[PDB]
């Protein structure tokens, strides 16, 4: 509600001849140091800046006195917070897993439009220089529109020529909504559709509804809260070392292992789905993710445990709990939500969370078995962080996998 560059309150505001205002830090960071141009409208402010920097009159005293009453990453987080503060109508967006520069977004077909009742998924990629460079926004759901083509590119002025740091991803999503309601056939991306819209509006409305029906019939994101698997880590420990406990500090490290493995597998599985233009993540993407990221025998065993859980899940009775159907301690239904919540794909198949849950359980068991062994070497009955560090370092494959995870 004040500074357009950093979306924070204005401090020592500087107003340029063009009357765009930014806080003194932002002004110094982007104008004074190099560009000497307004970041919003690119008006040259060199003569003005040199004069007033020498005379210490840059700051707008009147505005400043009466107000009392990296940068790219920081701002993206401010957008997401802003997005939660004022959820845009008919829209949602959030990061893909833990990648803040790669978001998923959903748009519900406006009531006014012929897309009503459909859900359209979009991909958003933030550049390194954001907010000074535009975000890359594209549809992954087919849609019949003059300004949207089969590649999912969107011809919208604010996405390219008219992009400004003052704009936000919420405003961008609202503008796309308006574009769905009111196309611009005069400057089209697809001429045939634009010609049809101009001459046969009834046909345009008809084809839009049929496409919406055929192809169109994505959230706050993974969130800031750290998930815990204490319940299921404990169950596995009782199976692997019934007479060995685990300290709560060690349990927090186990959560860090599980969450790290979850994010990496799903993230890669997300990469594969997008790479092959697949709407749904299935056990296949999870398996190829596992095979590429896990080393050696860990990968061979993880693939075995995942294939066996999926096989047992399909043949089992549909009445029992999903985790029970797969013979797993780790929660299948919960892993499924975390795959949808993380915005890795439009859809998530039912075998995917089973396979991933089984891979997580297997790796947890491996780590717990070795940590317990490492505890029994020091004549101890309870796993502490040090025994987790030992179990990782003393196993070449596990150290390749989890060595980068910090252990205190």
Report the nearest approach of Cl ion to the CB of residue 386 (Å). Answer: 25
Residue 138 contact partner, candidates Zn ion, Cl ion, none, CB within 5 to 8 A by sort of partner: Cl ion
Q: Please give the span between the terminal C-alpha atoms of the chain, in angstroms, as a whole number.
A: 41
Please tell me whether residue 47 binds Cl ion under the rule CB under 5 A: yes
Task: Give min distance, CB of 128 to Zn ion, in A.
Answer: 19
Distance CA 377, CA 244 (A): 13
Least distance from Zn ion to the Cβ atom of residue 88, Å: 23
Give the binding range for Cl ion (CB under 5 A) out of 38-46, 194-202, 236-244, 362-370. Answer: 38-46
User: Which CB sits closer to Zn ion, 8 or 263?
Assistant: 8
For residue 218, the minimal CB distance to Zn ion (Å) is 30
CB of 403 to Cl ion, least distance (A): 11
CB of 19 to Cl ion, least distance (A): 15
Task: Give the single-character DSSP code of 345.
Answer: S
Q: Which parts of 157-201 are beta strand (E)?
A: none
Cα 256 to Cα 226: distance, rounded to the nearest angstrom: 9
| Stretch of 46-54, 329-337, 378-386, 392-400 lying at the interface with Cl ion (CB under 5 A) | 46-54
Tell me the sheet residues that pair with 348: 281
- Partner whose binding site includes residue 47, from Cl ion, Zn ion, none (CB under 5 to 8 Å by kind): Cl ion
Q: Tell me: does residue 351 bind Cl ion (CB under 5 A).
A: yes
Question: Cβ of residue 261: shortest distance to Zn ion, in angstroms?
Answer: 38
Rounded Cα gap, residues 227 and 232, in angstroms: 12
Q: What would the x/- binding string for Cl ion be over residues 268 to 307, using CB under 5 A?
A: --------------xx---------x--------------
Residue linked to tokens 């979009």? 122
Backbone angles phi, psi at 395, to 5 degrees: -115, 110
DSSP class of residue 158 equals G
Look at the block and give the residue holding tokens 């460079």: 133
Region binding Cl ion by CB under 5 A among candidate stretches 7-15, 130-138, 298-306, 321-329: 130-138
- Residues after which the chain is broken (C–N above 2.5 A) are 69, 217
* Binding residue for Cl ion, selected from 59, 352, 363, 371, defined by CB under 5 A: 352
Q: Which residues contact 81 (CB under 8 A, 6 or more apart)?
A: none
Phi, then psi, of 104 in degrees rounded to 5 = -110, 145
Query: Residue 6 binds which one of Zn ion, Cl ion, none, with CB within 5 to 8 A depending on kind?
Result: Zn ion
Spatial separation of the C-alpha atoms in residues 264 and 73, rounded to whole Å:
20
Would you tell me which residues interact with Zn ion (CB under 5 A)?
A: 3, 5-6, 18, 20, 23, 26, 38, 40-41, 43
- Both tokens of 187, joined, read 């400057």
Using rule CB under 5 A, residue 18 touches Cl ion: no
Q: How far is the CB of 297 from Zn ion (least distance, A)?
A: 52
Minimum CB distance to Zn ion, residue 56 (Å): 20
Task: Give the binding range for Cl ion (CB under 5 A) out of 52-60, 218-226, 351-359, 375-383.
Answer: 351-359
Residue 123 has which token pair?
A: 């991909």
Question: Which H/E stretch holds residue 402?
Answer: helix 396-402
246: β partners: 383
Segment near Cl ion (CB under 5 A), from 49-57, 200-208, 229-237, 349-357? 349-357
Choosing among Zn ion, Cl ion, none, which partner's interface includes residue 41 (Cβ < 5 to 8 Å by kind)? Zn ion
- 138 binds Cl ion, rule: CB under 5 A: yes
CA distances from 224 to 12, 79, 94, 306, 342 (A): 31, 14, 12, 28, 12
Q: Which does residue 283 touch among Cl ion, Zn ion, none (CB within 5 to 8 A, set by kind)? A: Cl ion
CA distance 42 to 20: 11
Cβ count near 207 (within 10 Å): 16
Which residues of the shown chain bind Cl ion in the complex (CB under 5 A)? 44, 46-47, 138, 153, 282-283, 293, 349, 351-352
């Amino acid at each position: 509600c004040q500074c357009g560059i950093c979306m924070e309150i204005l401090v020592e505001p500087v107003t340029l001849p063009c009357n765009h205002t930014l806080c003194k830090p932002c002004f110094q960071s982007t104008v004074e140091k190099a560009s000497l141009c307004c970041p919003f409208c690119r008006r040259r402010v060199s003569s003005w800046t040199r004069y007033h920097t020498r005379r210490n009159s840059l700051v707008n005293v009147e505005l400043w006195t009466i107000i009392q009453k990296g940068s790219a990453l920081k701002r993206i987080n401010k957008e997401l917070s802003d997005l939660a503060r004022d959820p845009p109508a008919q829209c949602s967006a959030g990061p893909v897993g833990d990648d803040m520069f790669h978001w998923q977004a959903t748009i519900m077909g406006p009531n006014d439009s012929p897309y009503q009742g459909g859900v359209f998924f979009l991909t958003i990629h933030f550049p390194t220089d954001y907010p000074f460079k535009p975000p890359k926004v594209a549809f992954t759901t087919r849609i019949y529109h003059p300004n949207i083509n089969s590649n999912g590119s969107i011809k919208l002025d604010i996405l390219r020529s008219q992009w400004s740091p003052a704009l936000t991803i919420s405003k961008v999503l609202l503008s796309i909504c308006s574009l769905l309601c009111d196309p611009n056939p005069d400057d089209p991306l697809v001429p045939e559709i634009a010609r049809i819209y101009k001459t046969d509006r009834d046909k345009y409305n008809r084809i839009s509804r049929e496409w919406t029906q055929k192809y169109a019939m994505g959230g706050s994101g993974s969130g800031s809260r750290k998930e815990s698997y204490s319940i299921y880590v404990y169950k596995v420990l009782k199976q692997v070392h019934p007479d060995t406990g685990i300290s709560s500090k060690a349990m927090g490290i186990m959560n860090s292992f599980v969450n790290d493995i979850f994010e990496r597998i799903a993230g890669e599985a997300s990469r594969l789905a997008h790479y092959n233009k697949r709407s749904t993540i299935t056990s296949r993407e999870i398996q190829t993710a596992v095979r590429l990221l896990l080393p050696g025998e860990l990968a061979k065993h993880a693939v075995s445990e995942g294939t066996k859980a999926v096989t047992k899940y399909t043949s089992s009775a549909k009445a029992k709990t999903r985790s029970s159907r797969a013979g797993l301690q780790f929660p299948v239904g919960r892993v499924h939500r975390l795959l949808r919540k993380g915005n890795y794909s439009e859809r998530v198949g039912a075998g995917a969370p089973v396979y991933l849950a089984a891979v997580l359980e297997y790796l947890t068991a491996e780590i717990l078995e070795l940590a317990g062994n490492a505890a029994r070497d020091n004549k101890k009955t309870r796993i502490i962080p040090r025994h987790l560090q030992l179990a990782i370092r003393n196993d070449e494959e596990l150290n390749k996998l989890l060595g980068r995870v910090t252990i205190a």
